[PDB]
Amino acid sequence: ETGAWYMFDEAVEGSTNEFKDYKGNHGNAVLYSANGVVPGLNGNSVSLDGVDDYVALPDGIAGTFYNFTIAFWVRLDTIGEQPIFDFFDSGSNNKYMRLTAESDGKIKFAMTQSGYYGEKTITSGSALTEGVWKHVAVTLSGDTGTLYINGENVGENNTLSLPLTFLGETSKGYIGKSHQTDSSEDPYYNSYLHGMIDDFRIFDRALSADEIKTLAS
Amino acid sequence: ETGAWYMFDEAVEGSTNEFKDYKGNHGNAVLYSANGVVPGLNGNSVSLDGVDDYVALPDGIAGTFYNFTIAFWVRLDTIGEQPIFDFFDSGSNNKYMRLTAESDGKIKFAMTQSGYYGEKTITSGSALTEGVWKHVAVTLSGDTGTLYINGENVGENNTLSLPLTFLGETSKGYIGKSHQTDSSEDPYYNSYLHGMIDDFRIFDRALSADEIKTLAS
Ligand SMILES: [Cl-]
Ligand SMILES: [Cl-]
Ligand code: NA
Ligand code: NA
Numbered sequence: 408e409t410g411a412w413y414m415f416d417e418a419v420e421g422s423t424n425e426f427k428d429y430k431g432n433h434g435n436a437v438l439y440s441a442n443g444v445v446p447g448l449n450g451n452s453v454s455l456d457g458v459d460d461y462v463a464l465p466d467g468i469a470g471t472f473y474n475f476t477i478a479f480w481v482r483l484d485t486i487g488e489q490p491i492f493d494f495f496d497s498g499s500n501n502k503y504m505r506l507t508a509e510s511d512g513k514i515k516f517a518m519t520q521s522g523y524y525g526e527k528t529i530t531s532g533s534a535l536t537e538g539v540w541k542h543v544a545v546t547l548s549g550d551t552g553t554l555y556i557n558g559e560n561v562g563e564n565n566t567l568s569l570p571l572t573f574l575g576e577t578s579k580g581y582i583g584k585s586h587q588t589d590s591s592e593d594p595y596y597n598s599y600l601h602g603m604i605d606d607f608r609i610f611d612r613a614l615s616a617d618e619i620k621t622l623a624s
Numbered sequence: 625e626t627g628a629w630y631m632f633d634e635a636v637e638g639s640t641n642e643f644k645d646y647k648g649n650h651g652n653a654v655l656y657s658a659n660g661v662v663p664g665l666n667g668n669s670v671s672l673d674g675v676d677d678y679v680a681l682p683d684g685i686a687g688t689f690y691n692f693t694i695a696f697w698v699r700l701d702t703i704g705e706q707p708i709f710d711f712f713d714s715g716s717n718n719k720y721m722r723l724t725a726e727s728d729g730k731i732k733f734a735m736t737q738s739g740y741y742g743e744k745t746i747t748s749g750s751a752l753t754e755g756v757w758k759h760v761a762v763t764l765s766g767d768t769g770t771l772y773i774n775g776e777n778v779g780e781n782n783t784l785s786l787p788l789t790f791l792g793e794t795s796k797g798y799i800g801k802s803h804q805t806d807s808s809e810d811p812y813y814n815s816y817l818h819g820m821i822d823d824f825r826i827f828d829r830a831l832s833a834d835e836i837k838t839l840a841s
Contacts, residue, residue, distance in 0.1 A: 413824040436799075436824075448757050448822045453799075457818020461801035469826060470792015476827040478761035478772075478839055479799075483752045485818035488811045490802035491760075497794040501806045502787040506762060508817070512751040516762050516771055516779075520787045523807035527786060529762075529771050531778040532749030534729040535700045540665050543708075544695035545723060545733050545746075554733055554746050555695075561748040562733075569744060570719040570737045575687015577714040582653075582670075582696075584678035585707035589718045590740035594705045600725070601674020601702035605665045607630040607653075609686060610693040622695055 408432060411468060416450040418443075434465035448480050457485050469494045469504075477506070486512050501525075511536065532561045540603075542623035548613035558620035582607060625649060628685060633667040635660075651682035665697050674702050686711045686721075694723070703729050718742075728753065749778045757820075759840035765830035775837035799824060 412429040413436045419425045423443070425435040438444070440460035444451040453462060469475065477492065488510055495503030501522030507515045513533070517526040533556040535541055544555040547567065554562040571578045579586065583600035585593075608622070629646040630653045636642045640660070642652040655661070657677035661668040670679060686692065694709065705727055712720030718739030724732045730750070734743040750773040752758055761772040764784065771779040788795045796803065800817035802810075825839070 410827045411825065415822055415824070447820050452820045452822040454820050455800045455817050457816050459816055461816065462799040462821070462824075464797035464799065466797070467793045467795055468797050470788035470790070470795035472789060472792075472828040474763075474765050474828070474830045476761060476763045476829065476831045476836075477825070478759070478827075478831075478836070479824040480757060480759050480822045481752070482757045482820040483754060483818070484820070486752075486754055487815075489815045489817045490798070490800065490812045491817060492797070492799050493802045494788060494795055494797045495803045496788055496791075497796050498791075500804055503803065503805070504787060505802060505812070506760075507802075507812055508752065512753060514752060514760065514771065514773075516769065518769075518784060518786045523805045523810050527781065527784055529769050529779040529781045531751060531771055531773065534748060534751045535698070535703075535725065535731060536729060537700060537703055540697060540699045542695070542697050543723075543731065544693060546691075546693045548691050552733065552735075552746050554731065554748055556731075556748065562746040564744065564746045567735060567744055569735045570721060571687035571711060571713055572689060573687070574713075574715075575689075576684045578684055578687035578711055579714050580681035580683070580685050580709070580711045581707070582679040582681065582709050583672045583707065585710045585722060585724075586712045586720065587717055588720070588740045593740050595707045595722070595724055598704075598706045599674050599676055599678065600672050600706045600708060601700070603664050603669045603671050603699040603701070604679070605632055605669040605697045607632070607679075607696040608628065608694070610627045610695075611689040611691070612693065613691045614693045614695075619693075619695070 413462075413464075414449065415444050415447075415453050433468050436465070437463040439463070447482070452480075452482075457489070464494075466497065483508060483512070486510075533557060533559055544614070544619050544622065546613040546619070553613075555616075555619050555623075558616070558623035560616060630679075630681075631666065632661050632664075632670050650685050653682070654680040656680070664699070669697075669699075674706070681711075683714065700725060700729070703727075750774060750776055761831070761836050761839065763830040763836070770830075772833075772836050772840075775833070775840035777833060 493505040710722040
């Protein structure tokens with residue numbers, strides 16, 4: 408085998424803060440936390456105070472692979488800018504890969520060979536946050552439908568050939584209410600939107616992404 | 625021109641609850657809310673109580689188009705299952721398209737010609753929620769990197785040719801701490817993760833999506 412697995416269930420004998428690699432390929436992870444490990448998802452889990460707690464992994468654990476996967480379970484107790492993991496060159500400070508929590512619950516992965524300003528990144532999608540004004544749009548273009556939040560593409564379904572059109576002349580429309588469908592399992596029937604709405608707009612074509620962006624300005 | 629635009633700034637003369645289409649192509653939107661319109665994003669905005677308030681749009685506004693866009697601004701005051709808009713056949717209850725808010729701030733768009741159980745949908749991406757255990761994974765396969773939350777793909781960057789590899793033998797790794805980069809604008813330096821972590825795993829290849837799913841079980 409290759410790779411590692413930290414289950415963080417119980418310190419190794421002889422210590423209070425060392426946790427083994429269950430795959431038996433790498434050294435012990437070291438925990439710096441006054442909490443220690445506590446009941447969590449699978450047996451025990453690391454609990455970090457968000458102040459100065461972290462885990463040191465042994466050197467070399469990820470720098471010898473061309474392709475790879477890093478995976479773990481996490482319970483985020485504070486929404487904000489925070490490092491989740493960071494694997495970096497011991498010889499310089501501008502060669503690294505780091506997964507971060509973002510200003511809003513999104514996550515970002517960055518790899519760079521030229522410091523902070525050269526990061527190549529991947530960022531997760533936006534969602535609707537409580538009490539925060541956002542722009543939403545749906546576009547249908549042939550078989551492809553697209554969802555946008557603040558002018559960013561957040562989903563597609565390229566298999567949409569479909570209902571109202573034509574004989575849509577007498578179609579009904581609500582904002583914030585649904586009509587009664589054919590199913591009592593519909594959870595939206597009799598649910599009413601709690602919020603505010605503005606500039607409701609409809610177009611008889613599919614706007615492009617930067618067209619969408621411009622509305623979201 | 626074609627299409628509509630409801631700015632919801634001021635009731636039309638002679639009424640208390642009618643709002644015109646600024647494009648002058650469709651009838652008045654009708655508001656059912658004891659709140660009326662109030663200061664919002666652009667001038668005034670509709671405020672729905674989440675109990676029984678909604679807006680009726682005039683019949684036909686969207687059922688005569690092959691391709692289209694629906695776009696608006698929204699401020700969601702309660703996270704949960706709620707209809708945002710619904711355009712449906714006046715002759716049956718199983719021919720409609722509806723945009724909904726979901727259990728967690730995501731949004732879903734559905735079109736159907738065969739009732740609730742036949743909905744074809746588009747759903748926005750997951751994010752990390754406060755106090756909620758989630759599975760996260762990053763995979764690098766050739767030039768393509770992928771982010772996953774609970775086994776669902778939430779971002780990619782097909783242009784990743786890059787840093788540690790090789791000479792990665794002495795690379796350093798943290799969970800919950802970042803090293804100091806070359807920039808004082810780095811907001812992650814000196815930030816510490818507030819949360820829990822379990823089953824931290826590393827692989828020297830890129831797992832497939834259902835492989836990822838299986839870890840997220
Ligand atoms: Cl263990
Ligand atoms: Cl108006
Ligand atoms: Na564990
Ligand atoms: Na307005």
